[PDB]
């Protein structure tokens, strides 16, 4: 739904505006969980190939964890860019059309009469 | 005796002096004297030693009075900060009112036991205080649900005030 926005270069993974955003801290639960998934992938692969589950294929497990963390980092940066630009477009539209989004005044609990439902 | 007679009233005891018109000795008096000399004196000595140790290692604790936050009536709806603070102070006052009711009930039970056969006559002020506090508790916290809240209490009070105002029209 955001593909038609102005300035959308096609098939671009990370445009330069993404460079304005803070990257993931490289030890955050998303990337730690991605590394855990890579480790579990290596363990499951060893068990399916009927090798020792952790004593065998240390290079394979290292490659699995590294690839999962790498791809997860770049995908996470892309998703952060997408959510940030969605919030930016929403705030810009709010500022562009203020008559459709009125700052509605709420009144205190001294004028409104909430009906009371007793629980006898 | 941390408790005080201002909050836990007790009339002064009026015991009559003995008039031993018989010549028999009193086993109650003999047993109380022996009970004092055998049981009460060592227990008193142990408690005095314990109190001396406490006075050596004396420490203090305080009350933590809370101040009045703005209530539910004077801030806008949908503001969860003011609603949270008003709800917490209302729950605090609710618990305090529960213990006020407990104090009045203890006072009533003490009056009934102290007066015994004359409880229908001289417990008039205790029963009157119990009835008035019961009426106020029923006016403020009775029909509120198991999800009782400052908003529900305010709605009940506003409905009651509307009914009283409508009755005061005629
Ligand atoms: C030993 C193993 C861990 C080694 C860690 C080594 C690295 C390190 O130092 O990391 C510190 C690193 C420092 O992070 P931080 O930036 O300081 O913030 C820490 C906060 O606690 C961050 O806390 P938070 O509240 O911001 O959480 C982040 C957010 C996002 O977090 C995530 O996405 C990761 C969630 C991991 C679980 O979490 C959630 O939204 C929680 C979702 C919970 C519901 C999920 C429902 C599905 C079921 C359970 C998950 C699926 C498992 C398999 C299916 C079977 C389930 C029965 O902390 C973590 O990595 C925290 C997670 C550690 C455990 C991972 C899973 C085991
Ligand atoms: C931990 C949980 C995940 C384990 C994954 C690996 C599974 C595995 O291979 O287990 C076997 C292996 C032990 O096997 P073994 O005794 O050596 O020999 C294998 C036999 O030869 C095997 O004999 P066999 O296979 O020739 O014949 C027996 C056969 C006979 O067949 C059967 O018995 C059939 C059984 C059917 C019923 C079960 C169906 C599946 C149930 C799944 C779970 C459902 C309930 C859980 C909650 C809801 C989940 C949706 O199969 C089995 O008995 C099944 C074997 C596997 C059982 C364990 C399954 C684990 C995955 C599912 C549970 C975990 C995820 C959900 C829970 C999450 C937490 C709440 O397990 C482990 O070694 C576990 C890992 C222990 C070390 C963990 C170290 C962590 C280090 C973290 C730091 C380093 C990474 C840092 C990353 C971040 C960097 C930035
Ligand atoms: C391994 C992953 C390798 C990825 C290489 C680069 C891929 C790429 O160019 O992705 C950009 C692509 C198109 O971007 P966009 O113009 O937003 O298209 C709308 C489609 N949702 O973006 C997408 O198609 C979004 C989803 C990408 C999913 C990648 C992992 C599967």
UniProtKB/Swiss-Prot annotation, chain A:
Keywords: Electron transport, Membrane, Mitochondrion, Mitochondrion inner membrane, Respiratory chain, Transmembrane, Transmembrane helix, Transport
Pfam families: NDUF_C2
Keyword Transcription regulation listed: no
Record field: transmembrane: 57-76
A Gene Ontology term for the protein's cellular component: mitochondrial inner membrane
GO BP terms in the entry: aerobic respiration; mitochondrial electron transport, NADH to ubiquinone; mitochondrial respiratory chain complex I assembly; negative regulation of non-canonical NF-kappaB signal transduction; negative regulation of reactive oxygen species biosynthetic process; positive regulation of ATP biosynthetic process; positive regulation of mitochondrial membrane potential; proton motive force-driven mitochondrial ATP synthesis
Membrane topology term: Single-pass membrane protein
Annotated localization: Mitochondrion inner membrane
Homology family: Belongs to the complex I NDUFC2 subunit family.
Function: Accessory subunit of the mitochondrial membrane respiratory chain NADH dehydrogenase (Complex I), that is believed not to be involved in catalysis but required for the complex assembly. Complex I functions in the transfer of electrons from NADH to the respiratory chain. The immediate electron acceptor for the enzyme is believed to be ubiquinone.
Protein name: NADH dehydrogenase [ubiquinone] 1 subunit C2
Protein source organism: Mus musculus
Gene behind this protein: Ndufc2
Swiss-Prot record, chain B:
Source organism, top-level taxon: Eukaryota
GO annotations of cellular component type: mitochondrial inner membrane; mitochondrion; respiratory chain complex I
Disulfide-bond pairs as recorded: none
Annotated segments matching region Disordered: 1-25
Assigned keywords, A-Z: Electron transport, Membrane, Mitochondrion, Mitochondrion inner membrane, Phosphoprotein, Respiratory chain, Transport
Oligomer status and interactors: Complex I is composed of 45 different subunits. Interacts with CHCHD4.
Similarity comment: Belongs to the complex I NDUFB10 subunit family.
Described function: Accessory subunit that is involved in the functional assembly of the mitochondrial respiratory chain complex I. Complex I has an NADH dehydrogenase activity with ubiquinone as an immediate electron acceptor and mediates the transfer of electrons from NADH to the respiratory chain.
This protein's name: NADH dehydrogenase [ubiquinone] 1 beta subcomplex subunit 10
Organism: Mus musculus (Mouse)
């Amino acid at each position: 739904m955001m593909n038609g926005r102005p300035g959308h270069e096609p098939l671009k993974f990370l445009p330069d505006e993404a460079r304005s955003l803070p990257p993931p801290k490289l030890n955050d639960p998303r990337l730690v969980y991605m590394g855990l998934l890579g480790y579990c992938t290596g363990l499951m692969d060893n068990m399916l190939r009927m090798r020792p589950v952790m004593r065998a294929g240390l290079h394979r497990q290292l490659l699995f964890v590294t690839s999962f963390v790498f791809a997860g980092y770049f995908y996470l940066k892309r998703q952060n860019y997408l959510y940030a630009v969605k919030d930016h477009d929403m705030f810009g539209y709010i500022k562009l059309h203020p008559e459709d989004f009125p700052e509605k005044e709420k009144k205190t609990y001294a004028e409104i009469l909430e009906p009371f439902h007793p629980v006898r | 005796d941390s408790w005080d007679k201002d909050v836990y009233p007790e009339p002064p005891s009026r015991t009559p002096a003995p008039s031993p018109q018989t010549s028999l000795p009193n086993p109650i008096t003999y047993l109380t004297k022996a009970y004092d000399l055998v049981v009460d004196w060592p227990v008193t000595l142990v408690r005095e030693f314990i109190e001396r140790q406490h006075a050596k290692n004396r420490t203090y604790y305080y009350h933590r009075q809370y101040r009045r936050v703005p209530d539910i009536t004077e801030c806008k709806e949908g503001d969860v900060l003011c609603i949270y603070e008003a709800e917490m102070q209302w729950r605090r006052d609710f618990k305090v009112d529960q213990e006020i009711m407990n104090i009045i009930q203890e006072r009533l039970k003490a009056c009934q036991q102290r007066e015994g056969e004359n409880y229908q006559q001289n417990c008039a002020k205790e029963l009157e205080q119990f009835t008035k506090v019961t009426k106020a508790y029923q006016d403020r916290y009775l029909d509120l649900g198991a999800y009782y809240s400052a908003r529900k209490c305010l709605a009940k009070q506003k409905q009651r005030m509307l009914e009283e105002r409508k009755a005061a029209r005629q």
